[PDB]
């Protein structure tokens, strides 16, 4: 019920029939999920199915105005985590955050929007730290940006590969 949005995606990205897998094409471009969140704590996972050394992803959360024809984290509307070097991006500013991630990894994506906000990334069940705090108010959508022909699969829940031990949340699938 919660899926990659067909109406809200860069045309060059290749979306699977089940709308849970996406393949990138050349320069960065983005797709958002069909549902977003404004309040409370929420979670989803992305698995990197394939990612050769020349490809890359920036994954995280975007409001509706985030530019689909640019990397996630490019403008004020999104916050992202780069596979290459584990850099965090927002308004096109890259900052050190964690170690990088790649093919085979299962990344977790936590947000908390009390109404104090926080974005936390996970790698294979391991909390990589609070990336951003007190973020721009608005509705946030799970988001995927890809560079070149890598492939990733998103899971909105309710069944996660590495359900975090250290905090409470609802699966994004609760919105569907």
């Amino acid at each position: 019920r919660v899926l990659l949005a067909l109406h809200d995606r860069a045309p060059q990205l290749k979306i699977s029939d089940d709308r849970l897998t996406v393949v990138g094409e050349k320069g960065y471009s983005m797709v958002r999920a069909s549902h977003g969140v404004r309040k409370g704590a929420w979670y989803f996972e992305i698995t990197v199915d394939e990612m050769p050394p020349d490809t890359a992803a920036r994954l995280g959360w975007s409001q509706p105005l985030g530019n689909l024809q640019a990397p996630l984290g490019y403008d004020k509307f999104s916050y992202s985590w780069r596979s290459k070097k584990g850099t965090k991006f927002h308004q096109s500013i890259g900052k050190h955050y964690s170690s990088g991630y790649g093919q085979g990894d299962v990344l977790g994506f936590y947000i908390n929007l009390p109404e104090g906000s926080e974005i936390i990334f996970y790698k294979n069940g391991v909390n990589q730290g609070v990336a951003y705090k007190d973020i721009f108010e608005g509705v946030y959508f799970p988001a995927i940006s890809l560079y070149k022909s890598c492939t990733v699969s998103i899971n909105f829940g309710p069944c996660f590969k590495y359900p975090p031990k250290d905090l409470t949340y609802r699966p994004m699938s609760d919105m569907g």
């Binding site: 320069g27 960065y28 991006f89």
Partner: peptide, 10 residues
């Protein structure tokens, strides 16, 4: 296009 094409420099 480069991976870092959009990124602001330090």
């Amino acid at each position: 296009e480069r991976e870092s094409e959009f990124d602001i420099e330090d």
